[PDB]
Amino acid sequence: KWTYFGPDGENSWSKKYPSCGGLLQSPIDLHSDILQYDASLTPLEFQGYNLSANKQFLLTNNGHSVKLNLPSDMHIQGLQSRYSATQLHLHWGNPNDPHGSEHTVSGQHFAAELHIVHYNSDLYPDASTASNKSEGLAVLAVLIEMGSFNPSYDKIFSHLQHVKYKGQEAFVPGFNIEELLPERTAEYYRYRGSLTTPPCNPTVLWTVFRNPVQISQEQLLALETALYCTHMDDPSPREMINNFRQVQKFDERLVYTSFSQ
Amino acid sequence: KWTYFGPDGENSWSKKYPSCGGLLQSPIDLHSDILQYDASLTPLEFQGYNLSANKQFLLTNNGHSVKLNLPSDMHIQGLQSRYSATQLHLHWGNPNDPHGSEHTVSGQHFAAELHIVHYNSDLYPDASTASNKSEGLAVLAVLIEMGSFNPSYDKIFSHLQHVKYKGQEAFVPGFNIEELLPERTAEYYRYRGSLTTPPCNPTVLWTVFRNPVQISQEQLLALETALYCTHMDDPSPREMINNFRQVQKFDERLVYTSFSQ
Numbered sequence: 001k002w003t004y005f006g007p008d009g010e011n012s013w014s015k016k017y018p019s020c021g022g023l024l025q026s027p028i029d030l031h032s033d034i035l036q037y038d039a040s041l042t043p044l045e046f047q048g049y050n051l052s053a054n055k056q057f058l059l060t061n062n063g064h065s066v067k068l069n070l071p072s073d074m075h076i077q078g079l080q081s082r083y084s085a086t087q088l089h090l091h092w093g094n095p096n097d098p099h100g101s102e103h104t105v106s107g108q109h110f111a112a113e114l115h116i117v118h119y120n121s122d123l124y125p126d127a128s129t130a131s132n133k134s135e136g137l138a139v140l141a142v143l144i145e146m147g148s149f150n151p152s153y154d155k156i157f158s159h160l161q162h163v164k165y166k167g168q169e170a171f172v173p174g175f176n177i178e179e180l181l182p183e184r185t186a187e188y189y190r191y192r193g194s195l196t197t198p199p200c201n202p203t204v205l206w207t208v209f210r211n212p213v214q215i216s217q218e219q220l221l222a223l224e225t226a227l228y229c230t231h232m233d234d235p236s237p238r239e240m241i242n243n244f245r246q247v248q249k250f251d252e253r254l255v256y257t258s259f260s261q
Numbered sequence: 262k263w264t265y266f267g268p269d270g271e272n273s274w275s276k277k278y279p280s281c282g283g284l285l286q287s288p289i290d291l292h293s294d295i296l297q298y299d300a301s302l303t304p305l306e307f308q309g310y311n312l313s314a315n316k317q318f319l320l321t322n323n324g325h326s327v328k329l330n331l332p333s334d335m336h337i338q339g340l341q342s343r344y345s346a347t348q349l350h351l352h353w354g355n356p357n358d359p360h361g362s363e364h365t366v367s368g369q370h371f372a373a374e375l376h377i378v379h380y381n382s383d384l385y386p387d388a389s390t391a392s393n394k395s396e397g398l399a400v401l402a403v404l405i406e407m408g409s410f411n412p413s414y415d416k417i418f419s420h421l422q423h424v425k426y427k428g429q430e431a432f433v434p435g436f437n438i439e440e441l442l443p444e445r446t447a448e449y450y451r452y453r454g455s456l457t458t459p460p461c462n463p464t465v466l467w468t469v470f471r472n473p474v475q476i477s478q479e480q481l482l483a484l485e486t487a488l489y490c491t492h493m494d495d496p497s498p499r500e501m502i503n504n505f506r507q508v509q510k511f512d513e514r515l516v517y518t519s520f521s522q
């Protein structure tokens with residue numbers, strides 16, 4: 001199975017997952033040469049993000065990240081079709097090199113990155129089916145840097161120790177997922193790309209918000225150190241660290257921005 | 262038929278060249294978190310680099326770069342064996358994005374990069390034989406930034422229109438190779454890595470000089486527009502552009518520096 005280190009690492013994903021060596025691959029470096037303002041890029045509206053605190057949502061360690069399952073009444077409004085949420089998850093580095101975003105800005109990594117995965121539910125019945133299809137997926141990406149303690153991110157991080165090993169799960173009480181979004185969500189980068197993990201399907205409409213959020217050093221350390229890739233009884237455990245893909249070449253293409261200034 | 266673009270591009274090299282998916286890969290991003298000063302990195306000595314102008318050296322387009330063969334009486338001293346020169350070559354971007362170095366520094370590409378490849382002549386008959394043996398190869402890397410015209414690099418670039426196509430060869434009068442190196446060669450980064458092209462053998466001691474050299478926009482444009490990956494009679498020509506690999510995960514390596522600040 002695929003990993004981010006050793007012989008089954010990212011340069012080897014295209015053996016089993018051929019789209020990982022195809023076109024339109026993400027993530028990419030967002031730098032000024034390739035940015036172009038597009039006034040078509042109006043604000044998205046986040047509907048159904050205030051999750052019932054009387055519902056619970058499943059947190060899982062799937063051996064590659066920590067993921068929270070989201071309900072399909074949560075969706076983005078503002079794109080041509082409605083895209084309904086399926087799950088959120090994160091990517092990060094390690095305590096010796098705590099710069100594990102997937103997208104970079106002017107060559108720089110942020111500390112970590114959150115992805116909120118959605119699929120086109122006007123065209124397709126579930127995310128699985130949409131994933132290899134035209135217009136199938138939309139991912140929101142939030143860049144994370146170190147700064148202030150973030151109570152909202154702690155609504156997820158306080159459950160990490162319950163999902164330390166692969167296959168483990170936890171229930172998280174509903175909270176307002178919009179609290180994980182940064183300031184001025186009107187300001188974003190937009191490009192068509194791919195899933196950043198196998199099968200790397202080139203079917204994602206990316207929205208990367210312009211502004212990062214902050215989490216404290218202790219929150220970033222917990223994310224980096226709480227999880228393993230491996231099942232609890234694996235005699236050779238592997239820490240879940242450095243779970244981000246290297247940036248891909250992105251030639252003769254633009255990233256569109258909703259901001260000029 | 263590996264390339265830098267499309268189905269046979271770098272995310273697919275591991276399908277035919279297993280070491281490209283193995284550990285210890287180059288190039289890498291040189292950034293503070295993984296740098297450590299090592300006072301035992303004393304200056305290299307360049308001997309036999311001043312090639313006679315009355316002698317001539319073979320320049321060849323190998324389908325992937327342009328290479329100049331170097332004589333075995335050219336060596337680097339300072340390492341724990343003598344390493345003898347075998348060839349130099351370059352990596353670059355394209356006319357609309359002159360940012361094609363292999364190594365990056367704090368996330369930023371340079372315009373291009375020169376590699377001067379050596380093998381341990383104390384231990385091996387030639388560079389082919391040295392290439393699977395632990396530290397059988399030492400490559401020096403010079404970062405190239407867009408700047409002033411460089412008459413020494415022009416001793417190579419003035420021959421480019423004679424090696425436009427794969428397999429073509431030209432003779433370059435000898436000059437002093439040390440003129441291709443930057444200021445303050447005593448300041449360098451050193452690390453254990455690999456060849457940056459197939460077969461990606463993890464058998465290179467890398468020395469990247471701290472300081473770049475400059476060549477002009479016009480010399481970059483000539484390098485970026487003169488050469489083809491394909492033979493003169495190929496009916497699907499491919500321009501030799503963007504012939505650099507993306508940077509690689511560190512795999513727990515540090516990069517040692519001969520300079521402390």
Ligand SMILES: NS(=O)(=O)c1ccc(C(=O)Cn2cnc3ccccc32)cc1
Nearest residue numbers: 115117128131139194195196197198199
């Ligand atoms: N990091 S990212 O936001 O780009 C991303 C989001 C979702 C996934 C998957 O769902 C992967 N996945 C897991 N099971 C799948 C079945 C079909 C297709 C994809 C499948 C992979 C990466």
Ligand SMILES: NS(=O)(=O)c1ccc(C(=O)Cn2cnc3ccccc32)cc1
Nearest residue numbers: 376378389392400455456457458459460
């Ligand atoms: N860009 S770099 O300086 O890292 C580099 C330098 C040398 C080579 C080769 O010689 C490739 N090559 C070509 N034929 C070979 C036979 C054995 C081993 C390697 C062989 C590839 C990359």
Ligand SMILES: [Zn+2]
Nearest residue numbers: 089091115196
């Ligand atoms: Zn993701």
Ligand SMILES: [Zn+2]
Nearest residue numbers: 350352376457
């Ligand atoms: Zn090279």
